[PDB]
Every structure is written in structure tokens, then in C-alpha cells.
Amino acid sequence: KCYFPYLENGYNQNHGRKFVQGKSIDVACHPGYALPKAQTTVTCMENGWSPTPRCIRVK
């Protein structure tokens, strides 16, 4: 199972939940932040979440 991480500057409704392989999750960041490359969903895969959820500063 993949543990959904705490998200600095994100919406944290899924923090600490764990999910089976293949599960998708919506990720939302606060204004001024975003997942890289505008992505909004992550999927639990063999090596963890793909892509990696994290709320980076965006211009």
C-alpha cells in the first residue's frame, strides 16, 4: 500500500490514508502552489505515487 503524504500548502483531506496498488487520488494545492507540470491526479504504483504529490511554488 501507498501512504498518502502530508502536503505542505495543499489540501490535506487524504493525509495518513493508505491505498492499494492502482488507486488514483485527486491532489489539490493552495493558490500560488501546484503539482509540477500542472498534474492533478496521482496513482499508487510499484515504487510509490506516480507522479510524486508535492505542492511546489508556481509563477
Binding site: 503524504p5 502530508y6 495518513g16 493552495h30 511546489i56
Partner: protein
């Protein structure tokens, strides 16, 4: 007269020297946010993969890279540096020293120390502007600067990096004779943005009355 020009000169020099402050603090934030998240996940919940937490401490510690990025920001405001900034850099460094490889017992302390230091970087920019604007003779500008400082600090407590971006942009526009953008650029999601920008408009009016 002569002193007002020298005050304006001192401000413009500070603003130019510190113009990368938001870009550089955002750069630290982006490199570290995944690591910060992994530590918080481990410390707040049942997630137990210590190898991830060790890799996260490594981001904050390795080659003193992140410490040196903070020291670089300290050097930019050297002439005005607050004692609380030097103290919080040292506390970060001490918590990093306590972390030995494969020991994650100090992980939350490292994350907490980093977060306090990151906010204090923004506060140190504000404090530097406070020091400079306090030396102005014009009472209207002095008063408007003090209100700008206090609204800025309340913004920082809500979100440090967004506040810094707004502060750096607003003061940069003002001293480069660009009209201040007085509308919320972050959806009014940050409740303190509106009162900051109102104080920025009043500071702009006071600055232009001097500049004339």
C-alpha cells in the same frame, strides 16, 4: 531635501540588492518540500519507512547545501540582519548536527527548525525595510511604512512565501516608479492579502509625495 534623497537612495540600494529574495526562498522551498512532507508524514502518522525519512534529512543536510542557501540570504541583508535570523540559522544547524545517518529520531526537530527559519527569512526582509523606512524624515511616509510593516507581518503568519512574493513585488514596483498592482493576485484565498495591498497603496501615495 538632502536627507530625503539619501533615504530614498538607501531604500533603492536595499531593494536592488534583495530583489532575488523571493525567487531564492522559493528555490529552497521547492527543493525541500517533498522532504518536509515525508518527515511530517512519518512524525504525524503510522508511516514507518525510515529509509525515506533518512533520505529526507539528507536533503536538508547534505554538503551544507541548504544551510548555505540560507546563509546566502542572510548575507544579502547583512547591513540590517536581525539577531533572530542568525539564532534560527544556528538552531537549524544544531538540529542537523544531531541527526546521524540511519537515525531519524531528530527528524521532526529538523523539519520544525527549517520551517521556523524559512518564515524568519521573510520577517528579516520586512525588518530590513522597517529599519530603512524608520530613518525617513517625512512623517507621512514613516507612518505609512509602519502600517505596511505590520500588515506584511500578519500576511507572513498566514503564508510566508506568498507574503514574501507580494512584498518583494510591491516594494520593487514602488521604487522603480511602476504603479502598484492593488488587486489580489491569489484568489483572495489568503485573507491577509487585501489589507496588505491597501497599506501598500497608502505607502505608494506617501512615497510619491516625497519623490515629487
Amino acid at each position: 531635501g538632502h536627507m530625503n534623497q539619501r533615504n530614498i537612495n538607501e531604500l533603492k540600494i536595499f531593494v536592488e540588492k534583495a530583489k532575488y529574495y523571493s525567487i531564492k526562498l522559493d528555490a529552497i522551498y521547492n527543493e525541500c518540500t517533498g522532504a518536509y512532507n515525508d518527515i511530517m508524514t512519518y512524525s504525524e502518522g503510522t508511516f514507518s519507512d525510515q529509509s525515506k525519512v533518512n533520505q529526507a534529512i539528507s536533503i536538508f543536510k547534505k554538503d551544507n547545501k541548504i544551510v548555505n542557501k540560507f546563509k546566502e540570504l542572510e548575507k544579502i541583508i547583512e547591513e540590517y540582519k536581525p539577531m533572530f535570523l542568525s539564532k534560527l540559522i544556528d538552531d537549524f544547524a544544531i538540529e542537523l548536527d544531531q541527526a546521524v545517518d540511519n537515525d531519524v529520531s531528530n527528524a521532526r526537530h529538523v523539519a520544525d527548525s527549517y520551517k521556523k527559519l524559512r518564515k524568519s527569512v521573510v520577517l528579516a526582509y520586512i525588518e530590513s525595510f522597517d529599519v530603512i523606512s524608520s530613518k525617513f524624515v517625512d512623517s507621512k511616509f514613516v507612518e505609512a511604512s509602519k502600517k505596511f510593516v505590520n500588515k506584511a507581518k500578519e500576511f507572513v503568519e498566514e503564508n510566508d512565501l506568498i507574503a514574501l512574493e507580494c512584498i518583494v513585488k510591491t516594494i520593487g514596483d514602488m521604487v522603480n516608479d511602476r504603479e502598484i498592482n492593488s488587486r489580489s493576485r491569489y484568489n483572495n484565498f489568503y485573507k491577509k492579502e487585501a489589507d496588505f495591498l491597501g497599506a501598500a497603496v497608502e505607502l505608494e501615495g506617501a512615497y510619491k509625495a516625497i519623490k515629487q
